[PDB]
Design a protein around this ligand. Structure first.
Ligand SMILES: Nc1ncnc2c1ncn2[C@@H]1O[C@H](COP(=O)(O)O)[C@@H](O)[C@H]1O
Ligand SMILES: [Mg+2]
Ligand SMILES: [Mg+2]
Length: 200
């Protein structure tokens, strides 16, 4: 398996939303998961998961709660986005990412990590983190490696094509991140050289 990176960090956010995806509703991140994939052992070595308390639209819609399974009380008890991002940065530093170990972020598309983070950093008046400015977009990697159209790189289809079931609850951010990590593991086992393929 490709050992170009020592670790791959999979991040797939959940955000506030309304039914019908209205463009005037401003998204806030409500779940910040990180799955740490060891490229040498091909094991998920560790995970990070925190909910995040939205401030612009504090009350989750019924649609959002139904979609993600995240409840109002779970976000009520959560820390602010700046506090959660601080914890993520600490955790990554603890894992020695970017110092002892070479690493990349891996995502399920541009929206699913970068655009939500971009919106949220605007809202929180934070710099968009340089470490998140490039990533492996696994839909692009999968499409190019298995030679399938974009229509066939939906998360459930990627799993099904490879003889895998979805493990856990779809639209739980940590569970989606884990399933994306499972696909990445199989791609590495299959001989794919996963590489950064998208920049902001
Ligand atoms: N069907 C949908 N309708 C409205 N928003 C959605 C829908 N699917 C996903 N989203 C939004 O996009 C986020 C990430 O999607 P996902 O990674 O599939 O859970 C969700 O947390 C929602 O904010
Ligand atoms: Mg996603
Ligand atoms: Mg998700």
């Amino acid at each position: 398996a490709d050992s170009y990176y020592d670790y791959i960090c999979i991040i797939d956010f959940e955000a506030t939303c309304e039914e019908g995806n209205p463009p005037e509703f401003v998204h806030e991140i409500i779940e910040f998961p990180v799955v740490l994939l060891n490229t040498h052992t091909l094991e998920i070595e560790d995970t990070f998961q925190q909910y995040v308390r939205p401030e612009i639209n504090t009350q989750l819609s019924d649609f959002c709660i139904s979609l993600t399974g995240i409840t109002q009380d779970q976000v009520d008890r959560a820390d602010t986005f700046p506090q959660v991002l601080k914890k993520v940065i600490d955790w990554m530093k603890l894992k020695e990412l970017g110092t002892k170990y070479k690493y990349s972020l891996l995502t399920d598309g541009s929206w699913d990590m970068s655009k939500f983070l971009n919106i949220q950093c605007q809202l929180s008046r934070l710099k968009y983190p340089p470490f998140a400015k490039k990533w492996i977009n696994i839909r692009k990697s999968y499409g190019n490696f298995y030679k399938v159209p974009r229509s066939q790189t939906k998360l459930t289809i990627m799993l099904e094509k490879l003889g895998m079931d979805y493990d856990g609850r779809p639209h739980c951010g940590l569970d989606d991140s884990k399933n994306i990590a499972r696909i990445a593991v199989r791609m590495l086992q299959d001989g794919c050289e996963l590489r950064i393929n998208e920049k902001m």
